[PDB]
């Protein structure tokens with residue numbers, strides 16, 4: 001009669017919370033989805049071994065078209081877990097699943113875990129200064145999504161930072177790199193010419209948040225566009241004007257050039 | 266010979282990540298602060314039992330004024346951990362402590378934990394639609410801060426949601442309720458008359474996120490201002506224009522008036 005939405009956290013199998021792991025271990029059935037994102041620092045086998053029970057992975061279609069026929073039936077007479085990368089319901093499509101549970105007469109509870117949305121605090125940027133967020137998707141065919149450019153523009157003009165989630169082709173395990181995102185943004189700049197993203201734009205890259213050794217780097221696009229930030233996942237942030245403490249953290253912890261202290265503050 | 270910043274999570278001792286727990290268990294010295302937020306579902310004793318270590322609690326002054334004198338000295342010869350409610354670097358100024366650690370020749374690492382900043386996803390509001398965040402501070406003496414009002418105005422005018430962290434005075438055990446926040450905002454509205462926060466404004470309240478049964482309520486200020494949302498901590502959210510799916514979740518899960526379903530496109 002109960003369905004638990006359990007977050008797996010940021011990077012590896014130990015990023016789940018103690019609460020999430022203990023609840024999952026007591027569930028009769030464990031399902032999971034790995035399409036809103038992936039857990040780059042681990043494998044399905046390692047997560048399965050930690051929990052101690054077999055995990056039934058659902059595809060995007062399984063969830064969107066058949067969640068109520070795959071997961072909910074068992075949740076009616078058993079305790080069922082539905083694992084998701086990060087924090088449940090940060091991904092926009094998760095929320096509606098709680099309504100489906102209600103419709104099926106199934107109780108649902110959410111077990112939170114770290115999300116990249118909040119983990120960016122490790123960049124040293126003040127969380128309150130983050131404005132609207134956006135995702136940079138891989139162009140495909142004649143589709144070159146670029147609304148994120150206006151998101152950066154609108155946030156920056158109000159002195160706010162912009163968090164850019166980078167695309168991940170989950171089934172192919174293809175992660176968009178900060179380099180690829182910067183290249184796309186420069187192309188969009190060529191088309192819009194709003195002076196929003198250029199070689200002189202200060203950006204912050206966070207790779208493998210959750211790891212004990214994530215890569216945290218800050219600097220100008222001209223210098224970072226071809227830099228190796230290591231294995232995935234990557235996110236990119238275009239900060240707005242900086243508080244001196246934010247800049248000092250970027251310089252001392254993220255290796256930002258001293259120039260940001262007199263250009264971006 | 267290192268320092269670990271470890272988040273404890275939203276509500277109780279089990280909100281710590283498995284990664285954080287296993288690292289804390291092996292540290293030689295453990296410090297913590299409980300003034301940045303309130304973990305309503307646990308006690309210092311329960312946390313100490315889980316980690317199997319004695320925890321030295323520090324005050325705001327101990328940290329902001331003497332962190333490098335109380336904590337770093339030990340971190341130079343042993344593995345030390347500094348625990349905090351929620352995520353250690355969200356809506357705190359603890360990131361700056363990593364700069365102090367570096368200057369003292371101490372390597373530091375960060376272990377994330379679920380944060381209220383991302384937990385708001387449980388309200389059904391799209392995370393990417395949240396704009397700048399603000400804090401509703403307690404008026405004191407002859408002062409009455411109102412900056413948070415302008416944050417709501419700025420976000421709302423561009424269709425973004427506003428997350429309002431509520432004040433806390435741990436030493437005096439004062440935790441601002443969503444009710445008090447609403448009362449304060451109505452008083453600011455009477456002064457600025459910007460039509461930003463009135464009796465007809467739709468708001469969302471999230472209380473005790475992280476617990477299995479948090480209070481999630483949505484409705485007009487006039488109806489919720491005197492409603493009992495349970496024990497603290499609370500957070501207040503003033504949504505911008507809603508997407509139909511956001512409204513549906515607020516109605517089905519947060520008990521919002523069905524009239525909000527009729528979104529004014």
Ligand SMILES: Nc1ncnc2c1ncn2[C@@H]1O[C@H](CSCC[C@H](N)C(=O)O)[C@@H](O)[C@H]1O
Nearest residue numbers: 275302351352355380381431473474498499
């Ligand atoms: N579990 C919880 N439920 C509701 N509000 C919470 C909360 N935890 C924190 N808050 C809100 O956030 C304020 C503390 S701000 C510090 C936040 C913390 N670093 C984190 O990552 O969550 C509180 O005064 C309250 O308004």
